[PDB]
Design a binder for this molecule. Structure first.
Ligand SMILES: Nc1ncnc2c1ncn2[C@@H]1O[C@H](COP(=O)(O)O)[C@@H](O)[C@H]1O
Ligand SMILES: Nc1ncnc2c1ncn2[C@@H]1O[C@H](COP(=O)(O)O)[C@@H](O)[C@H]1O
Ligand SMILES: Nc1ncnc2c1ncn2[C@@H]1O[C@H](COP(=O)(O)O)[C@@H](O)[C@H]1O
Ligand SMILES: Nc1ncnc2c1ncn2[C@@H]1O[C@H](COP(=O)(O)O)[C@@H](O)[C@H]1O
Ligand SMILES: O=P(O)(O)OC[C@H]1O[C@](O)(CO)[C@@H](O)[C@@H]1O
Ligand SMILES: O=P(O)(O)OC[C@H]1O[C@](O)(CO)[C@@H](O)[C@@H]1O
Ligand SMILES: O=P(O)(O)OC[C@H]1O[C@](O)(CO)[C@@H](O)[C@@H]1O
Ligand SMILES: O=P(O)(O)OC[C@H]1O[C@](O)(CO)[C@@H](O)[C@@H]1O
Ligand SMILES: [Mg+2]
Ligand SMILES: [Mg+2]
Ligand SMILES: [Mg+2]
Ligand SMILES: [Mg+2]
Ligand SMILES: [Mg+2]
Ligand SMILES: [Mg+2]
Ligand SMILES: [Mg+2]
Ligand SMILES: [Mg+2]
Ligand SMILES: [Mg+2]
Ligand SMILES: [Mg+2]
Ligand SMILES: [Mg+2]
Ligand SMILES: [Mg+2]
Lengths: 326, 326, 326, 326
């Protein structure tokens, strides 16, 4: 019955919004559809395999990384709502030219999941939207804000279906793409994560490098102290994919710092922050183990951060272990 | 350039085949396309949520389980090539009626991945094809054969793309579905798995129940004895999904027996056997830890079995640990 | 390169428009896509065959007539831009409720071509947009304006491809629907009709009822006075279809009054007016034979009118014959 | 419920056929789907506009003409059922190479409707299938047979929907393409044309060149002798399109010889013959005005012929006028 487009427009009314934010969200979706479609046939269009350059964070980049980076920059440019872009794949910040310039700042991972592209596992797109407070000209700085300033955030999952997850001050709603008429249809409204769950998601290959808090916690998941049944384990290897299962199943997801990565591996602007926002707006929690992720003031558009999120009873348990070892 | 249909037909020539096996493979694909399509929009068509009955193996069944079971039975019936069907969801064997009866025996998991349906993670279809040796009437027995008698086997993956993996005596080929013209297009011909890999896939929540061989092996993956870097870890929760990554990445996949499941959890006819066939035809190995899976003579259409597969240097390593503890 | 959505938005800028007119045009397209899709498979979804009621103009109505009437009313309602609707299929005017009310008046033939639905010949949608001048409450009257007040007009053709033809004060542009990503892509910008053409389109079965001007004109088409080759003849039976060929080929289209239909058969609000607007904005002409169609002040939302349009040298020729017989 | 593929296979059984004819029909459909898809987006893929060469019959050829010619030759080649091809666009006959050679002879208009390509009006594909009687090597001669030897014939219509019309000795059935799963679904089984109808289809621009029989007949359509209401008139300009409306509506279609075209304009092998077969198998009639079309022995693969077909009471009426003037 309800399309995204109806929903967003109506929300926009309720908010009295002028319309900038709404064209912006519509430009984005269209971008997502464009990607879903490329993605569902990459091999036939021979989009697997690398393009060439490595990237600021040392990521080998491949043709899909680029193709989807471009659609997006380009669709945001032409939205006429954004003055500053931030891309996984882009070394410095993109300052939109004046004629198309607006007052929104959008950070994004055009394609998360690089590992799983070739083996056809779920992939996605991550984005965050901040509003330019400042009055100086639109420099890079304007994209250095703590997540708590996010006005909107979400991700697209290209899993067994394509889905858009969007979250704003009100709450979280899930829309699915009808491949048939090319429109997103709302399927879940105002979702909330379970208070406690059954699954722990973490890459255990790093067992060697984990700190003693994570180590203990994992142990506690596998040998419950109280005899309850033990937690099940899932790690896909795509954040968007693991985070999503966690939103709708409950449980907890983990990419904490390690001996060799004091700040963990995920990127704070365009990975960590959006997900923690979503998680919190759904009734989730999202910490580094020492601080809430949204409260970190960024000093590099490309910086990394530890991320632990999901059901709040589950997250809490780890935080207490963390303090214990303090 | 090359469609499935061209390929199969040509193979059929090279084989001098009469044509039964080829209509059979074509009936199947069509079934897969039918499913992919339902699947990419289940939520819009409201196919998430359960149907009602539990199943012989105690599986909660849900609407997609059924919808895809039916398309398939029905498309195989009408292939005119099969005399005996075996379904995850079907209590006893389906004996095809004479008028449509043929000489092939097909076992199948219409939908593997039940956990991940609601969270939109990759799902698939598994199948095996045996040829009826016997001359008695077509009873259930005829589907009790060791995998080594498989004439064809494979799976469909509904991941970020839909893909058909088919394997016959010659070798393994991968085809992808062009959503646009509704035909499968061959993308990889005569694939082979790497001899040794970087990833171990297993549900570690069972850490408590593993035997001492698996335990040691996991330990050896996380703390290499020789200082090489440690293996990475992936478990999606969909066999088809994990097995596929393993075929194209190398590495190893594991659902071994545990303290509470002496024979492991995966089903030998319609899960274990096809995958081990594929794996071996690709240059893989597939054991219970004590015997090759294909060599087990089945005595129940619905029986379970331990399954360890993937790169042969990787599989070997575990077998030696297994013998060690012998 | 350019989507509809980019185009319209940009036009809207150039026009300084507040945004109402632009959400309105976007709501409409979406409606068109919805229809194209139903239409390309009506038979499979069993949309051929009648619904039940006859209609104000005595039209037998059938399931597609309804299905597309509804999508449209509903998508216009929710546009939040329109206060008064006019439907082929609707007896009296639809007054939008206040909460969704806007300042646009849209008349429309949800589905033109009824004859050719069952035989799968081209069908289309016609629409006109007027802006409410008045300050009284939004009654029906507000949709009684001469075409010259149209702020926008066009049609969708579901021919061998789906196409959107839109025309505003600037000129005419053609967009095509990419079935694949579900977006309209501009293919022809700022089109203009040829000054004189080779084709006459008219239903000659009415030969008996034509007046002496049309009769003479047809004769002159078949036996040129100057020996030039004779004009070719096309009548599909779908106005949208015939009018479109005429825009891009040149020539002339005819549904003039007859002995038994003093005012011809096509409906002025939602058929005649949009087409004449398009035609004129493309450099065409559009007369009853006695007056320009756009200049007629309507007194019934459902009234009929003669319509002759196309290349201006061609139209002129008939007008002179018309005056001759004056 | 029923797909083409089920239908054809079953028919094939009833016929005891070996299977050649059935792979052949399946190869063809696939070709049709390929075309429908190109066609529904030609403009976006920029397939409008000419390729270059003129053709044996003096036809300006354009990119779609070629693209669809190729898919088809190629898909028939690889069917392994055909030894001799005949193309609108091909100067001499295509003799299939031995390795792929079979025993069927297929004549075809890869794309009928050239006029209406640019204006997006309905277009189609026409084909005829003959079986090679002869024992000499497969030369061109083998495609010179009277239509009565056709074992199968039909056309694809890319109208507001794509449809396959197939006719064999049994009768005629209509299938529609589900754009969504890419399979043809049977919608009308064993169709029959009305005995008498309301519509005459002919290009009246040739009024000057018609003979006295056609002239009188048209006159009789416009001024009934008995006062019945007069017939309506439709000519789209695409044979496939006009012929189809005639099959399902009744009436009559006309491209008779004229003063300047003693043998009319349509091509006997790949246009005239298939349509007359269909028409007759549906309970239709199909004459030149002097002889049945199917009974003409062809002497040039590219020859032309007059064609008059449709409801038998309607066709008869003209034949009597023809004899009258004898
Ligand atoms: N479509 C919308 N959905 C939710 N909030 C909106 C929308 N449009 C405007 N707003 C609210 O109004 C603010 C400014 O939007 P804008 O009017 O484009 O500047 C945003 O930060 C939103 O919180
Ligand atoms: N399309 C095909 N692809 C591969 N092998 C085939 C094919 N058709 C027939 N064969 C071989 O011939 C055997 C019998 O097939 P059939 O002729 O249908 O009984 C199969 O076990 C295949 O090994
Ligand atoms: N997207 C647009 N395209 C063309 N003209 C527009 C557009 N938006 C606004 N306008 C012009 O501004 C007028 C009022 O539009 P609105 O601002 O919605 O009331 C219309 O009559 C148009 O002529
Ligand atoms: N699928 C089919 N549908 C209708 N007739 C068929 C079919 N297959 C075979 N036949 C009949 O058998 C003849 C030879 O076909 P084949 O067995 O391929 O040589 C044809 O002329 C048909 O009349
Ligand atoms: O393989 P690793 O080191 O566990 O990291 C995987 C992570 O990296 C990412 O590809 C982002 O770079 C995520 O999608 C995923 O969660
Ligand atoms: O959650 P578990 O117990 O690890 O089992 C998951 C397995 O079960 C299955 O759903 C098959 O029943 C597989 O797809 C998957 O590998
Ligand atoms: O069959 P007639 O009387 O010529 O009218 C056909 C016309 O009627 C319509 O269906 C509109 O009612 C047009 O699409 C078409 O041009
Ligand atoms: O424009 P004409 O001379 O009437 O011929 C149109 C005919 O030519 C064709 O394009 C075939 O060449 C047919 O589709 C159509 O019926
Ligand atoms: Mg990267
Ligand atoms: Mg990325
Ligand atoms: Mg990423
Ligand atoms: Mg189950
Ligand atoms: Mg299953
Ligand atoms: Mg399973
Ligand atoms: Mg009507
Ligand atoms: Mg209508
Ligand atoms: Mg109409
Ligand atoms: Mg030609
Ligand atoms: Mg042609
Ligand atoms: Mg033709």
């Amino acid at each position: 019955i309800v399309t995204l487009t109806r929903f967003v427009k109506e929300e926009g009314r309720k908010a009295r919004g002028t319309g900038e934010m709404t064209q912006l969200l519509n430009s984005l979706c269209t971008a997502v559809k464009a990607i879903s479609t490329a993605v569902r046939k990459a091999g036939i269009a021979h989009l697997y395999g690398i393009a060439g350059s490595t990237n600021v964070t040392g990521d080998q980049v491949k043709k899909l990384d680029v193709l989807s980076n471009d659609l997006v920059i380009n669709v945001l440019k032409s939205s006429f709502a954004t003055c500053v872009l931030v891309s996984e794949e882009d070394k410095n910040a993109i300052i939109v030219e004046p004629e198309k310039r607006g007052k929104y700042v959008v950070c994004f991972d055009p394609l998360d999941g690089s590992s799983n592209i070739d083996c056809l596992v779920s992939i996605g797109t991550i984005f965050g939207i901040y509003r330019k407070n400042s009055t100086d000209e639109p420099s890079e700085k304007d994209a250095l804000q703590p997540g708590r300033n996010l006005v909107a955030a979400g991700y697209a999952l290209y899993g067994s279906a394509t889905m858009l997850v969007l979250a704003m001050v009100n709450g979280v709603n899930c829309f699915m793409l009808d491949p048939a008429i090319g429109e997103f249809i709302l399927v879940d409204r105002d979702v909330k994560i379970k208070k406690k769950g059954s699954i722990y998601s973490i890459n255990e290959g790093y067992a060697k490098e984990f700190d003693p808090a994570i180590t203990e916690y994992i142990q506690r998941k596998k040998f419950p102290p109280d005899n309850s049944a033990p937690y099940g384990a899932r790690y896909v290897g795509s954040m968007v994919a693991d985070v999503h299962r966690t939103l709708v199943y409950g449980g907890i997801f983990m990419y904490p710092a390690n001996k060799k990565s004091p700040k963990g591996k995920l990127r704070l602007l365009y990975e960590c922050n959006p997900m923690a926002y979503v998680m919190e707006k759904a009734g989730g929690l999202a910490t580094t183990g020492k601080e809430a992720v949204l409260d970190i003031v960024p000093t590099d558009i490309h910086q990394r951060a530890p991320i632990i999120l999901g059901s709040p009873e589950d997250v809490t348990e780890l935080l207490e272990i963390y303090q214990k070892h303090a």
